[PDB]
Every structure is written in structure tokens, then in C-alpha cells.
Amino acid sequence: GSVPVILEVAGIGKYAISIGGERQEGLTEEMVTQLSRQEFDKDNNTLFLVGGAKEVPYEEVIKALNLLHLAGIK
């Protein structure tokens, strides 16, 4: 609530997540879903933001946002 949830696109199927200051790297798409869903179910007002690195294509960024929508995050 106080500190947003940040999901970072690192490449193809590789993602990083920042939860209230704590950053988790080397996560899979299925695992990132688990975490995103668990945080959204415990706090239904958590601000969610998605960013990708320069080496990440915009198409991949779309996929990430798509995964969040699939699990009802955004």
C-alpha cells in the first residue's frame, strides 16, 4: 500500500519484482503471476507499475502487461 509493486521486464520470459523495497530477480512468468496475484489479493489498492530495459522489445512489454491482466492485476 505505502510502497508500490514494481515489475521489471529483463528479457524473454525473465522478470524482476520490487515489493515494498525488496527486489526479487530471476523470476519466471508463472512465478511472477503467483507473487503478483498474492499481493493483489492481500491488498486490493496496491499501485502496480511495469517497466522494461532498453534491450527489451516493446512487444515483450505488451506480453507482461497482458499477463497481469490475465491474473486480474491490471
Added chain:
Amino acid sequence: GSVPVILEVAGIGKYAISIGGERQEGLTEEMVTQLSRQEFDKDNNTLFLVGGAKEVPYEEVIKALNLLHLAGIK
């Protein structure tokens, strides 16, 4: 560089931007482009992230990412 650039989708055509701790609200799409482009041209390694509020549709989030791509931000 040290502090990312955050672009927040507030609704339809309304956006907010956080630059190194400073937040700007009530920005237009054309104006948000100006700022995003100026920051990216001065610092070509600035981490960029996009997040939307619960009342914002995913389709609008796509549009925002689309605008960034158009100006060569991501």
C-alpha cells in the same frame, strides 16, 4: 540516471510523471511526450516505467506505452 522516470496513467489523455522524485500532474499526451523526450535525450540510460490506476483500462495503458515508442523512449 540514479532515480528512474515514472509515467502514471490517470485516465483518458491525463497523465502524471515522476522525475527524480519530482511529480508533475495534469499533463497532456503531447506535453508528456515533450518531457519524456527531453529526459531521454539528456540521459540515454534513464530507466523508464509505466503504471496505471485501477480505474484505467488496460487498453489505455497500451496507448501510453505506444506513445513512448513513437517518441523512441521504449
